[PDB]
């Protein structure tokens, strides 16, 4: 059933979750289906594309002389998992920032969900004049618009398909990387860049086998 029309189709579905036989009826139903799984693949990718860039950027810039070493700290010692460590000097405590996080996000996320349940629904109601930017598209993962694609890149359809899968190939790689950051940290107890600096120095001596 994998025709290959999709961007990131390379014929790898051993367990057959994307088949159209499952969820035969019509309705909302369950989450295992082509409409939701295709959507969550890029969402896990985009969030991971941001995370893997940010988990290693302060450490690299810290080894370099640009950023102060006080701020340059391992991604797991910056406030998450306070047993690991906690940055004392922010402009506010973590829990105050979490309420900022929960609020400003839960607008963004639930507004996106209603567009999945009811396309174009968020433009119809008044939202401080920002309604023109949320018109959406046929595919919810790639809405586009005056903001999300403010610089219209793929005016041609063929160029979009090339970009639509470069978003995935560069993205599915990042998901693996973050899985490496978590596993590296537990065993090594050090940042991801310092672990690289060791394998380049003593590869045979610094390794998972060790």
């Amino acid at each position: 059933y994998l025709d290959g029309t999709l961007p990131g189709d390379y014929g790898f579905d051993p367990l057959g979750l994307l088949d159209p036989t499952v969820s035969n009826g019509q309705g909302a139903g369950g989450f295992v289906n082509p409409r939701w799984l295709q959507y969550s693949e890029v969402i896990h990718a985009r969030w991971a594309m941001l995370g893997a860039a940010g988990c290693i950027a302060p450490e690299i810039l810290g080894k370099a002389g640009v950023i102060p070493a006080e701020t340059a700290v391992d991604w797991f010692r910056t406030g998450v998992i306070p047993p690991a460590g906690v940055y004392k000097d922010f402009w506010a405590d973590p829990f105050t920032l979490f309420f900022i996080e929960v609020v400003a996000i839960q607008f963004a996320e639930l507004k996106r969900l209603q567009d999945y349940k009811n396309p174009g629904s968020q433009s119809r109601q008044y939202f401080l004049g920002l309604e023109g930017l949320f018109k959406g598209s046929d595919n919810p993962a790639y809405p586009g618009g005056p903001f999300f694609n403010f610089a219209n890149f793929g005016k041609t359809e063929a160029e979009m398909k090339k970009l639509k899968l470069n978003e995935i190939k560069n993205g599915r790689l990042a998901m693996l990387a973050m899985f490496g950051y978590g596993a590296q940290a537990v065993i090594t107890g050090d940042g991801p860049f310092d672990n690289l600096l060791a394998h380049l120095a003593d590869p045979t001596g610094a390794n998972l086998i060790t």
Partner: protein
């Protein structure tokens, strides 16, 4: 193999809540008699009778089972919560031997505060006998905050389980194909559930429970204990307790597993401090159990062209004497739920019986063997649960023969050949019961008659015509002398019941060798009498459910019917339902003596306070001499041990004195239903309806006496409840007031 689901089959609304009886065609009309009410609550969960579709029956079952889990999880969370806020766990943890548990404090209205007894620990409440305190200590739990969080987790998971039952029925319900993928269930339920679940517990045992219980047994105060997360983060702390942790998973991947001998052990026996199993041994057990179930889960074929297929296995084990054997069973078990329910209940009930034996001799939790009320309550509980479950197999197997039996699939099969020599089964089994009841119970009457006549030399006893169980005695020594020869690496034996020395804890013995004699011979043979008979009643009902010589057409009458009629001299209680109704009385007579065997034996020969000069048992070791006579069971067990219950008025055990009486009322009350019949009562109601009619106050729903099968069910229910609740009061009051 693949996933298959049907979206939004059923709309969710309260429309059918207002219309009771919608599931059945007969009940959807409405009530004109009061019999409609009893049939409603009865036929509610008989999904096979509602509709012929096997798919809908599967959707209903898979979603109802989610309900029992949610019902369990709020019950389980209640114990954790009630143990956190209304208990003395922190006090008992610091002085377990002297302080008694309690988690059910009572409110102060009329009387009812005296039940809050002086338990100890600056606390007063009801004394529990469920063994939660020893369970929470076997795992690392020092504070009440851990119990609160554990309770909130259960409510969260329980709502998810309830949510799933709605989702996987009302919104997105699987298809019949998804259910018939049987080979994937065993693969997932062996490896995933039993395999990883045991492996995970070893993670909790290894990383948390072992160090915490090591410090607690070394006299350290609970508040000074490092919290269990500290052992995870700090490799240095736990290394001080078990130095093997310093190496850090290099021994595992290099296959040098001897380094882990510090905390993975084969000690055997019991802990001298706690009177419980070595916690290091259990982590090794559940670890090896995981590797065993993991390989078992990679057996079948599911999708990747490797593995076995259950159908080819079954239809390949054939024999001459059997003919066509095991052939048409894969079609049975994949099509009828009742067949599986019969098999599973049989081995889920016989397992709880195995749990009851294998805990009392091998106390896994600390400070359990010294809590005699707890050790006696878990045995009695998990045995009764086994008897009910086993009897359910005889009921839920006869339903298969009546409803889901197609003779076309079964020709010269194992199931067909069993029916064709059924009269040989019941006949040969009838002789055994008579042989045993004579040679077993007749021996008791012989001892009674000899004693009353003044001929005690002629009784069956130790000072007498001894009948000693030589085979069990040989097995006790073999398992006792095993560490020398058959299990060299074993430091000691599995339990001290086989042989050895006493293990004393808090001045009380946890376990000591049990000696078998002439009395233990008679009792172990009395149990076989009650068992071979209980099988006769159920097995007869199964084979003769579909047809008999008296009634060649029972299957058309159905599973439960009272009688065909007065003809043929009488056809009352001929159905398979009425065989189950009789088997329950024999299950009761069986386990009631298995339980009396456990109480008098362990009080007299095992339990007691250890002094400088030996042990002083509770009943002075009178099981050997008195048990041979039935009057001994009446004098030394019933009349004697009932002193604590009867004298409970004016103390915290007063509730047991009342339940002891109320249990007798409900028992005798059942006799009205068993002895009598519907006919007398329906006429009496007519003379009562006249007065209610004379005053123009009469129900439009006509009053009708209970059906025949209902009067029989109502009897055995109030019967068993009164018979079982009496022991529940006679035991806990006897044992809580120790001796």
């Amino acid at each position: 193999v693949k996933i298959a689901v049907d979206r939004n089959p059923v709309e969710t609304n309260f429309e059918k809540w207002a219309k009771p009886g919608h599931f059945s065609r007969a009940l959807a009309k409405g009530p004109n008699t009061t019999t409609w009410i009893w049939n409603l609550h009865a036929d509610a969960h008989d999904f096979d009778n509602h509709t012929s579709d096997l798919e809908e029956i599967s959707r209903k079952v898979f979603s109802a089972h989610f309900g029992q889990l949610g019902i369990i999880l709020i019950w389980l969370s209640g114990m954790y919560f009630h143990g956190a806020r209304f208990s003395n766990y922190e006090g008992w943890l610091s002085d377990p031997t002297h302080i008694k548990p309690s988690a059910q404090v009572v409110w102060p209205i009329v009387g009812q505060e005296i039940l809050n007894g002086d338990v100890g620990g600056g606390f007063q409440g009801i004394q529990i006998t469920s063994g939660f305190f020893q369970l929470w200590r076997a795992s690392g739990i020092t504070s009440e905050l851990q119990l609160y969080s554990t309770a909130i987790g259960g409510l969260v998971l329980a709502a998810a389980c309830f949510f799933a039952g709605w989702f996987h029925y009302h919104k997105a319900a699987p298809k019949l194909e998804w259910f018939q993928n049987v080979e994937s269930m065993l693969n997932h339920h062996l490896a995933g559930l039993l395999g990883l679940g045991s492996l995970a517990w070893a993670g909790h045992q290894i990383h948390v429970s072992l160090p915490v219980n090591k410090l607690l047994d070394a006299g350290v105060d609970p508040k000074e204990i490092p919290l269990p997360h500290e052992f995870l983060l700090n490799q240095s702390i736990i290394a001080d307790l078990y130095p093997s942790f310093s190496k850090g998973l290099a021994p595992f991947f290099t296959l040098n597993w001897a380094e882990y001998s510090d905390f993975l052990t084969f000690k055997g026996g019991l802990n001298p401090v706690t009177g419980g199993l070595w916690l290091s041994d259990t982590a090794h057990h559940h670890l090896a159990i995981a590797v065993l179930f993991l390989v078992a889960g990679h057996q079948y074929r599911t999708n990747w062209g490797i593995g076995h297929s259950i159908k080819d296995i079954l239809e390949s084990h054939k024999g001459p004497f059997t003919g066509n054997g095991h052939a048409g069973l894969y079609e049975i078990l994949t099509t009828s739920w009742h067949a599986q329910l019969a098999i599973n209940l049989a081995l889920f009930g016989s397992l709880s019986i195995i749990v009851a034996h294998h805990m009392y001799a091998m106390p896994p939790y600390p400070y359990l063997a010294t809590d005699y009320g707890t050790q006696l309550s878990l045995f009695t509980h998990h045995m009764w649960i086994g008897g009910f479950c086993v009897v359910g197999a005889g009921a839920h197997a006869a339903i298969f023969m009546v409803r889901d039996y197609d003779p076309t699939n079964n020709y010269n099969n194992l199931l067909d050949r069993v029916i064709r020599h059924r009269d040989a089964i019941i006949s040969h089994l009838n002789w055994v019961s008579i042989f045993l009841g004579f040679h077993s119970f007749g021996l008791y009457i012989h001892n009674d008659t000899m004693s009353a006549l003044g001929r005690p030399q002629d009784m069956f006893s130790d000072t007498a015509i001894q009948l000693q169980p030589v085979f069990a005695q040989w097995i006790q020594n073999t398992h006792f002398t095993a560490p020398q020869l058959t299990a060299p690496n074993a430091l000691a034996a599995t339990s001290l019941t086989w042989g050895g020395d006493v293990v004393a804890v808090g001045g009380k013995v946890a376990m000591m060798p049990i000696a078998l004699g002439t009395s233990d011979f008679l009792v172990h043979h009395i149990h076989a009498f009650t068992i071979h008979v209980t099988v006769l009643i159920l097995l007869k009902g199964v084979l003769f459910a579909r047809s008999s010589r008296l009634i060649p057409d029972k299957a058309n009458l159905g599973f439960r019917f009272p009688c065909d009629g007065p003809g043929r001299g009488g056809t009352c209680q001929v159905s398979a339902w009425d065989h189950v109704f009789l088997g329950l009385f024999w299950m009761y007579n069986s386990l009631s003596i298995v339980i009396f065997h456990f109480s008098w034996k362990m009080q007299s020969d095992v339990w007691g306070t250890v002094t400088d000069s030996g042990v002083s048992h509770i009943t002075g070791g009178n099981f050997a001499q008195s048990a041979n006579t039935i009057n001994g069971w009446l004098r030394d067990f019933l009349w004697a041990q009932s002193s604590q219950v009867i004298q409970s008025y004016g103390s915290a055990l007063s509730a047991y004195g009342l339940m002891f009486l109320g249990a007798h009322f409900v028992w005798a009350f059942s006799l009205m239903f068993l002895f009598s019949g519907r006919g007398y009562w329906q006429e009496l109601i007519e003379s009562i309806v006249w007065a209610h009619n004379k005053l123009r106050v009469a129900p439009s729903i006509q009053p009708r006496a209970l059906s025949i099968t209902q009067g029989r069910a109502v009897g055995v229910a109030h019967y068993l409840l009164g018979g079982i609740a009496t022991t529940w009061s006679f035991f806990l009051a006897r044992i809580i007031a120790v001796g």
